[PDB]
Amino acid sequence: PDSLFFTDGQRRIDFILVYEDESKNEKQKRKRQAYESNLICHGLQLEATRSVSDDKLVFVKVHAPWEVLCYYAEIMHIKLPAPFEKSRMNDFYILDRDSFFNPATRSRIVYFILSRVKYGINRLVSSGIYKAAFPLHDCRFNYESEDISCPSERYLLYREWAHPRSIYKKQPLDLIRKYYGEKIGIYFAWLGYYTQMLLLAAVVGVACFLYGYLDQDNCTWSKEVCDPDIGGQILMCPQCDRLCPFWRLNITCESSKKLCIFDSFGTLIFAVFMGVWVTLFLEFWKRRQAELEYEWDTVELQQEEQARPEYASAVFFWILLIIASVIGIIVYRLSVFIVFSTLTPQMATSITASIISFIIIMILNTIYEKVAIMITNFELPRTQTDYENSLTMKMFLFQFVNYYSSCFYIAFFKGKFVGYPGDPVYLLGKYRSEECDPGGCLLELTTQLTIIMGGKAIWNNIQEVLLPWVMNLITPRWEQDYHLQPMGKLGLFYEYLEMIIQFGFVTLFVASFPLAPLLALVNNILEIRVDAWKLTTQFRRMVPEKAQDIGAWQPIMQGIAILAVVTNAMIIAFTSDMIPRLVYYWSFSIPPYGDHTYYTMDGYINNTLSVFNITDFKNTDKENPYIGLGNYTLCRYRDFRNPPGHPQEYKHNIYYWHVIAAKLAFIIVMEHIIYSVKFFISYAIPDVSKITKSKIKRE
Amino acid sequence: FEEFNGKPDSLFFTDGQRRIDFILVYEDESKKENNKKGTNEKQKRKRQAYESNLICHGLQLEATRSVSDDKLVFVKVHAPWEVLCYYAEIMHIKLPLKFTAPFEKSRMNDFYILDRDSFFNPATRSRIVYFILSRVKYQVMNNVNKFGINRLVSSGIYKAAFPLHDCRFNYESEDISCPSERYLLYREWAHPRSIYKKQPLDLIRKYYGEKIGIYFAWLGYYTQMLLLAAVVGVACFLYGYLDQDNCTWSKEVCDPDIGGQILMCPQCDRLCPFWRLNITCESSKKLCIFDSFGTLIFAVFMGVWVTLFLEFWKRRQAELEYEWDTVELQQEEQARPEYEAQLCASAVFFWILLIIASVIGIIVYRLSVFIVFSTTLLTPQMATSITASIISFIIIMILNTIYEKVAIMITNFELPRTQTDYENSLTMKMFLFQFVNYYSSCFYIAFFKGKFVGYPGDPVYLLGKYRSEECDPGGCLLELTTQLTIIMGGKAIWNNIQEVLLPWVMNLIGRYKRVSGSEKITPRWEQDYHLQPMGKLGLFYEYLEMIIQFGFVTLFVASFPLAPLLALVNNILEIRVDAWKLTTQFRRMVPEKAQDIGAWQPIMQGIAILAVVTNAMIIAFTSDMIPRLVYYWSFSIPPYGDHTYYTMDGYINNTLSVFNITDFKNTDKENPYIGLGNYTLCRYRDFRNPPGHPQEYKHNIYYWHVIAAKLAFIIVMEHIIYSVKFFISYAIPDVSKITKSKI
Ligand SMILES: N#Cc1c(C(F)(F)F)cc(O)n2c1nc1ccccc12
Ligand SMILES: *[C@@H]1O[C@H](CO)[C@@H](O)[C@H](O)[C@H]1NC(C)=O
Ligand SMILES: *[C@@H]1O[C@H](CO)[C@@H](O)[C@H](O)[C@H]1NC(C)=O
Ligand SMILES: [Ca+2]
């Protein structure tokens, strides 16, 4: 009756050893028989059952006798999930002398016993000695189990927390760590509290975004860019080599109006706020980690060493990092090139380039993970924890480069090192440096970032789980569980990697796009339930494991924060064009330099653009693109340089150095202020949380 | 009990087989009691309760009448083996060998035990009996328990309580069996005749405990690292000295054909007339010597050396912790609230007082300079700077004691939970007060002096009659160096003199209170009672002074390469000054244990972190290195300059600005400059457009280029030094290989 115990026997299962009869290399069959005989002889009860669907396949069952299992568990440091000790049976009440131990704990202990066995459960599966070994779920999730004794914990947890109907329901970590293990429990607690604080980040970001959005009318520079009498008269220079004429500047009202949203004081305030939000996230997560460590069964002894089933090139890895970064940059550049070489149209072309870049990123991710795995295996880590740590580092670095190259390029290395029209820059020869429009490449950067984040989260979640669930929205236990498949040894690793990449996206380039926390919040709200459903539905049961913290990812979080402060400062200083506007408003709109009687932004664009003379087309005396293109003689370009007819011909003028001094002063002041606040908040742990230590140490 | 038996240096009981551990001193009833005799009787009853409880707990006692004054009674103490072992077991004290488990009586055969007292060193016995005295209780009234030896001296029932020094420091004990550790320490450790021999930290630990041993080990290691730093700094200073004919700007200012022709512009109102830059040819030489690229190299080397010092101190700390086997007692630590006990307002008051202290320091330095300048009428300028620095240092020394007292009051008004909390609050408050007090003037000179003064036409008067001070063309680097060296050297000298003298003069006054020609033999306890009490704070002030010295060494090291040398000589003297005052003019401090220096280590970390930014800002703003580099790289070229190749020629002439004298606007004081009536334009240290021009006196391209270069240099140095410090910290294993093997 699909019972969780042996036939006509009150003994509960802990693994299924499925073996296919060789009758449909006899030394392999002899080894299998010897291993089974030894397993039986060690004092483990076993039953043999033939698959109902196919008689050829026979399943080998195992159990755990109470006395021997308890003795072998007490042999080493295993405590109660009052303390357990074979000298104190009557001292502490036992709910039942046959089922007191948590089924997860019994599965863990018997797994340890099988691990100690030598002719290798996974080795036997690889060699075909025993095809697989995996425990059984309490009940098939479709409907609650008939058996009264079985609590049907799987169905109960599914309905309570894995079904989307509980979307607003708070996290029930109780059954999670009672059934799956400490790893999944801590992972889900971390995910949930991350979402909790992403809510605060998203509300603050939305406040800043509305601050920017409601000031459209008073965005003077955009208004001037649009007014034909002001914007149109500015006949800009061509920004390419062979396929661009003199173009007016008022063709970019849509771009300027969109940019005035993400490039106002709201963005700066939001970056400042995220500066302290990141440290609050880290510190409060440390505190929740400590609280979980105290509350849950995390006082277990730490194992020293273990064997591995399978058992200087460091610079060689860095070369691969460099190649990957260059490949990403090349991919983005060629994508934009091909899309250009054919209101909405320019934005649609940018979106198409971003989509192609994301497609290439996703295609290359598989190659990156494969190469990382092989190179890590070539080193032959002594144990498995070291192997996981090294894989974490290498995989995270490939991901980091592959996902952030394009972003870093657009933010910093695009339009920042191009010369004046007379003497442009060709670093490698015939490879001109692209130049941003007067507003800058901030809008393109934010479009790229939002497209990448969306595409990743959406496509990944859909293709990995949601197909059965979206179409829905539109035999014995051992056989059924066998029909399922495992998650391997890096499923939790992949979930952590996805979450870390999402965190990096939301924190690093947060100045450009103040709405990133909201998208990450929605993604996490989806992802927690998606992962719950997938784990509890489509994947076999897993042996529980104990972990205190998330693992090797916390250092990545700290590094990402320390990098994000600098990245945000650099973005606001260079990528955006707010510092030039501030400097103009406060210094160059006055009689000493300007002509206005009071600080006003009137005439900013006009008075900021530098003029160029076609007659000085080249210092190299080569072919010019300004040939023909009408009877025009002078064109204005995006740079701070002295006009023709000045003693210094096309050299940086006073305004350039004023603006660069302002940029560096902003970088210094913001960096120092944010780091000081971060250090104060890290030093004020005792002065904020008088509650926690007193509560813990009083009782 | 009886009186003095006749053996003056005997450290045993009258029988001669028992050893003394403390001397309990009180005043007998034979004194002329006043006020209320009921209070006197209560003190008596408390005293008999004390003695009764002590005898009950198993401590043998005997009293003795002071030989000179009958009104003083000395009460000895002795710890038999049973009680000593009991309290050692409950303290988890680890016992010497030559892996390990706590100490139990059952295993005497596994330790090198010969006799009861001989096995236990006097320091541990004194600590054990001190704990016994602190914990024991006598009586309860008002439904509140009462106890504590410190409360006894607080109430005046007991004048003091202290262990006994082994013997006279300058003579061996007449007992052939006495180790006379004090004499050995005096002959080899103290008594600066041994100014060079390595101090025997093992004997210091054995005698004065780990609290003093760790301090002196830290001092010695600090001296060694300062020797390394001073050698490097001397190398850099010597390199700067051997190249003076090559400082082209120094030559230009010195040469009368170039510097003399430049008619500089008055800084003053009617106190100074015009003047020729050539007068400033010596300062220029000195600046060459202390602004050189040697200064930059030394600043980077200091950024590295502060780290190396911190991590090597951590390594030595781990070594000491292993060797001195303090782990068990470190694990078992328990403290009780101050017997005085038996918030945000205070914090804001402390911060306001700290701000006031900073402002007072700035104002006193400015007033000293003002009065010295007004009194005016080997360089006379140098003499004026030295006089102003001397006055400022005097006032700083005066205000130091006031700040100490106010910190004491602020911390006492609050209710510290336990001794450690009070100690840490005092550490923080004292360090902040002395930081502000000592460094306000230096920071003012470095950053806020001569940095926000306008052109001569429109000077910056703060609020009226207060014209902002401004520097010479080279900069105030030399003024800062003079002020810093004067402050540091004067503090070293005065501190050493005061430390050596004040306990000594107090002892001589105490003797003079008995002008009668006694000249006789007194027992050990009586003559040890005449030393100073060594107030319970302990090495707090020693650590404070060394932390101030370290702050001076690191914070401003971009303006004084010789600071490590001064610090080295000061520390070589300080080792022996502290050793002498500790061995010869103080009662035995009760031994204890400490993991580290204390609350000061976070202070040292903070100083190291702030040093990078302070040095970067010094080199960027107070020094004129960056303007020189900018001129050599971007203004000695045809686009702006005239030289075909990069060179420092014409630097001074081209750098300065010009001002039309008749272009002095404003109706107040219409005749500040035209009085002389000799020339019509003046040159001042500033980067501004010359007269005429569309932008007459607004900053020119040179100013903004130099500002951008300064900020870029600040960013680059900060980031590179921080990264190198991070990598140095990561690379260092923090524990030596020998320690790893043994541990
Ligand atoms: N020249 C020179 C100086 C020399 C040396 F002789 F070595 F060159 C040494 C020295 O201590 N100082 C020098 N100039 C100083 C100005 C202020 C304070 C100290 C000063
Ligand atoms: C720009 O202004 C000119 C004024 O002549 C005009 O004709 C054009 O429609 C405006 N808009 C764009 C996008 O060029
Ligand atoms: C000061 O300048 C005068 C005038 O050129 C010159 O004669 C004298 O030698 C100079 N003195 C110094 C010390 O430079
Ligand atoms: Ca001292």
Residue numbers in the entry:
A (entry chain A): 59 to 82, 91 to 147, 185 to 222, 232 to 423, 457 to 487, 503 to 634, 647 to 871
B (entry chain B): 52 to 149, 183 to 426, 455 to 489, 503 to 868
Task: Provide the authors' own sentences about this structure as they appear in the paper.
The dual functions of TMEM16F as Ca2+-activated ion channel and lipid scramblase raise intriguing questions regarding their molecular basis. TMEM16 proteins form dimers; each subunit comprises 10 transmembrane helices (TMs) and contains its own ion conduction pore surrounded by TM3-TM7. Here, we report evidence for a lipid scrambling pathway along a groove harboring a lipid trail outside the ion permeation pore.
However, lipid densities along the membrane-facing surface of each monomer are absent. Instead, in all three classes we found a strong oval-shaped density in the same hydrophobic groove identified as the drug binding site in our niclosamide-supplemented dataset. Our structures show that both modulators replace the lipids found in this pocket in our drug-free sample. With both modulators directly contacting the extracellular-proximal end of TM6, our mutagenesis studies suggest that residues on this helix are critical for drug binding. We thus speculate that, by binding to the upper part of TM6, these modulators may simultaneously lock the ion conduction pore as well as the gating element in a closed configuration. The inhibitory effect of both antagonists was significantly decreased by all the mutations, confirming that these residues are important for binding these inhibitors.
